[PDB]
Amino acid sequence: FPWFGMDIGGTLVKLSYFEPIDITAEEEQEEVESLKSIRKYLTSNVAYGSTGIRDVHLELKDLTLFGRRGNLHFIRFPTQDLPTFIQMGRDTVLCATGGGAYKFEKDFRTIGNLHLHKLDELDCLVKGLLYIDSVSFNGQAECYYFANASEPERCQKMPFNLDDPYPLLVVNIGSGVSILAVHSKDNYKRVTGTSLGGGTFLGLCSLLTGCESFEEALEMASKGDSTQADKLVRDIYGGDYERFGLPGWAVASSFGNMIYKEKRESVSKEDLARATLVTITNNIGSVARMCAVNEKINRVVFVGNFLRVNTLSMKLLAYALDYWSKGQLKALFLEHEGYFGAVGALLGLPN
Amino acid sequence: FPWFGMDIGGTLVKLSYFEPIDITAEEEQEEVESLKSIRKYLTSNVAYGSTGIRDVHLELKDLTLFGRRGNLHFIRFPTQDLPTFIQMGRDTVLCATGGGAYKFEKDFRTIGNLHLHKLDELDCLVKGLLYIDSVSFNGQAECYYFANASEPERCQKMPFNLDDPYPLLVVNIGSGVSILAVHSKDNYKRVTGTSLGGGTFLGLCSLLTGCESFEEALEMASKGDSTQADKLVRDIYGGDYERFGLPGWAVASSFGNMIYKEKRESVSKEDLARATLVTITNNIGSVARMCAVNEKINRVVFVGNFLRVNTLSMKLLAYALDYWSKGQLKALFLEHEGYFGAVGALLGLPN
Ligand SMILES: Nc1ncnc2c1ncn2[C@@H]1O[C@H](COP(=O)(O)OP(=O)(O)O)[C@@H](O)[C@H]1O
Ligand SMILES: Nc1ncnc2c1ncn2[C@@H]1O[C@H](COP(=O)(O)OP(=O)(O)O)[C@@H](O)[C@H]1O
Ligand SMILES: CCCCCCCNC(=O)CCNC(=O)[C@H](O)C(C)(C)CO
Ligand SMILES: CCCCCCCNC(=O)CCNC(=O)[C@H](O)C(C)(C)CO
Numbered sequence A, B: 001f002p003w004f005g006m007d008i009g010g011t012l013v014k015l016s017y018f019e020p021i022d023i024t025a026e027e028e029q030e031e032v033e034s035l036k037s038i039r040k041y042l043t044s045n046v047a048y049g050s051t052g053i054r055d056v057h058l059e060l061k062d063l064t065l066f067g068r069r070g071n072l073h074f075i076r077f078p079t080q081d082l083p084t085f086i087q088m089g090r091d092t093v094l095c096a097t098g099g100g101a102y103k104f105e106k107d108f109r110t111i112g113n114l115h116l117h118k119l120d121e122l123d124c125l126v127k128g129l130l131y132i133d134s135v136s137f138n139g140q141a142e143c144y145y146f147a148n149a150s151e152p153e154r155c156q157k158m159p160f161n162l163d164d165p166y167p168l169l170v171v172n173i174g175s176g177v178s179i180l181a182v183h184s185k186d187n188y189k190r191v192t193g194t195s196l197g198g199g200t201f202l203g204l205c206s207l208l209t210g211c212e213s214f215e216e217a218l219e220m221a222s223k224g225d226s227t228q229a230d231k232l233v234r235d236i237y238g239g240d241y242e243r244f245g246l247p248g249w250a251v252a253s254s255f256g257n258m259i260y261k262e263k264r265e266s267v268s269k270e271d272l273a274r275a276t277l278v279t280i281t282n283n284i285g286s287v288a289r290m291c292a293v294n295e296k297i298n299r300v301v302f303v304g305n306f307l308r309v310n311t312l313s314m315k316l317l318a319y320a321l322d323y324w325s326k327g328q329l330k331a332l333f334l335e336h337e338g339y340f341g342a343v344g345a346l347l348g349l350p351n
Helices: A025-030 A033-044 A079-090 A121-135 A198-209 A214-222 A233-237 A261-266 A269-295 A311-324 A340-347 B025-030 B033-044 B079-090 B121-135 B198-209 B214-222 B233-237 B261-266 B269-295 B311-324 B340-347
Strands: A003-008 A012-020 A052-054 A060-065 A068-078 A093-097 A115-118 A143-147 A156-159 A168-173 A177-182 A188-194 A251-253 A299-303 A330-334 B003-008 B012-020 B052-054 B060-065 B068-078 B093-097 B115-118 B143-147 B156-159 B168-173 B177-182 B188-194 B251-253 B299-303 B330-334
Touching: A003 A121, A003 A340, A012 A033, A012 A079, A012 A340, A033 A068, A060 A121, A068 A079, A093 A121, A093 A340, A121 A168, A121 A177, A121 A188, A121 A299, A121 A330, A121 A340, A143 A311, A168 A269, A177 A269, A188 A269, A188 B269, A198 A214, A198 A269, A198 B198, A198 B251, A214 A269, A214 A311, A233 A251, A251 A269, A251 B198, A269 A299, A269 A311, A269 B188, A269 B269, A299 A311, A311 A330, B003 B121, B003 B340, B012 B033, B012 B079, B012 B340, B033 B068, B060 B121, B068 B079, B093 B121, B093 B340, B121 B168, B121 B177, B121 B188, B121 B299, B121 B330, B121 B340, B143 B311, B168 B269, B177 B269, B188 B269, B198 B214, B198 B269, B214 B269, B214 B311, B233 B251, B251 B269, B269 B299, B269 B311, B299 B311, B311 B330
Parallel strands: A003 A093, A093 A115, A168 A299, A299 A330, B003 B093, B093 B115, B168 B299, B299 B330
Antiparallel strands: A003 A012, A012 A068, A052 A068, A060 A068, A143 A156, A143 A330, A168 A177, A177 A188, B003 B012, B012 B068, B052 B068, B060 B068, B143 B156, B143 B330, B168 B177, B177 B188
16 A cells, blocks of 8 residues: 555645655566556646645655655645545545544545544654654755844845754644644643634635735735834834833734724735734744743744745744844744644554 | 823823812912813813713722822823824823823923923833722722633622732733733833734724724624634544643634635624634733743733723633633733823822
8 A cells, every 4th residue: 555644734634655666576566556546646746636736846755764765745735625535545554643634534434445543733743843854855954044034135044953953842833823842752742822823814814805825815915014004113102112122113013003994095905914924923923932932942943834935924933033032042944844744644654 | 280190002092180179278269270170171071072081980089199189080082182182281290101102292392381201101000000909999999800710601700809919910901912020019021012912903803894993893793703713623623632632612723714715705794803802812811821820920910901891802811811721820800991001100290
């Protein structure tokens, strides 16, 4: 059977698949036509059905896993569309994590000779993260930060070495947000979380702007000025609030200028998309910053698909952590985005 | 001259005025007609112009302040409308706090023989709070909580004694939010804050629903079901996420069901108003809860006008703190709402 790890989240299904590349002659016969057709379907297409996507650029090549050489592939689709995945399967051991491993268990069981092995969402995240960092992204670093994050003509994505990571704060920004303090490979706690996550960003954006996808929401946002919606400290003070170090440019009240009819009539969709992005991102950064200080952790890794192709949010997080802590905290990011749970699930297979 | 403390905030001006009631005969002559007309205007009307409001129900009677007996009055109006206040004045020592004490300083100076004494916003909050609690609300407690907050047929506003308050966490929810750890009368720090405050509630509500006032936003909210907009843990898991104690009913992603077109078409304005309220309130409660635990403080007092006539938010805060901490934390509230800074300013007069 084929090697999968599946993370069925509240918005997206993440699927990691190990394509073997060391198949001997005696192994190519012994392979059944059903297995050969799944292998070929997966590796010959980068789009599956109407909403499945293979992220070719993330592929890990010539990896050795469980004694075998192969390539590790990364595939996502909407959770919504999982019934089509299951139909395909029925028309193997599946290591499955995320909420949908439980919610859709009965649906997986419609695949006749399928054994579902449920694994914990945050266990898999941490195992996946550490594993991907340990193998590298084809020789390049999996982890990166933004050098000189507080100077935005100078700010640059640069590699960061995670070889002795502990203690690490891990902020997983998906539909919602879990924040973990990882003290060793086997010891971590969920310190806190927030329901104001990626789902809140797109949920509010769609309602405010009429955008119909994540990508369109980011595009509107890129053209927007969040200070049109937001009431700033200088709007209240006429400058800095010196005593408590709040510069005039800091947001006093997110969307707070939208209490005035005149302002609501002059604000653009793009402005509201950007304010939504800024509000959700800064809130998360503010909570992470607080957990870091309280846990005595100076490196904070943000992951999950809220940040996928989202440089606005990543740089804002890097800036916010660096500025407000005067360099004591560093925001870190990982090239494999939101796929760690799926990898972690896959790593559970020999058990 | 008349005794005022004024807190000019990002949304509302709060004005505390001390009406003397022990005026001798030799003092009633010596009083100039201008002073007599301001006194009479203030005390004979409960509405001033089109947007000024006197909160009669909050009046403290027969208070002794600075050697004099009087009644302490509480008055608010939109900051927006401050030019009309100033016109009245010019058409005295003013102790002024909040951001607008700085922003509008030049405007105050148009009142010919006015001395403006600027005081710090959070200094005045703490001084005012402690003072109002120490004098009582006409024999009744200024501070209260919700007894049995986690059982909502049993939940009841009950008086709470603040006679030895320290340490206390103070959450000031106005346009934005400041969170203070108060360790004695003179020693406190601003531990953190959030820009997702009262202004965010009404700002987003107005944009989402077409409501044109705070009160209308609460009224829509009262009729709404926030679980229509919000994606719950049970929507992801099909039940509880047991391992990390997240019951199926907890919000996984605020507004997270609004990523689906079908859902956006079936959701009501009332549902969105309630989801806005729930999202803003729980986020604040979640941050306060975290600061309390980290500061080793078990009483959290929430104040500010976000909570004015807002039992939905107060009970949700009381429930959230009690439930998620298993009784270790108590949410507290204060009868004088958002007026503490204005009182604190007034208390600065003899300096
Ligand atoms: N193609 C996409 N479709 C839907 N959401 C996306 C997409 N790309 C990025 N996102 C963002 O990613 C978030 C989901 O992240 P993910 O880590 O997969 O979490 P979950 O396990 O909750 O699905 C969404 O809330 C959204 O903000
Ligand atoms: N009559 C009102 N007009 C405007 N906002 C109100 C009113 N009543 C309650 N509010 C709420 O009170 C908040 C302002 O609280 P306040 O403590 O006066 O803060 P600030 O000093 O920022 O003005 C608003 O953001 C709103 O949520
Ligand atoms: C004092 C108020 C305290 C309120 C505490 C409840 C806040 N809510 C949360 O932490 C859930 C956030 N969401 C998540 O972690 C994730 O979406 C998962 C559900 C794990 C699925 O990926
Ligand atoms: C790592 C990200 C850290 C981000 C830190 C900035 C967050 N913003 C704030 O705390 C301001 C909230 N607002 C207020 O406190 C009040 O409205 C006042 C401006 C005092 C006027 O009453």
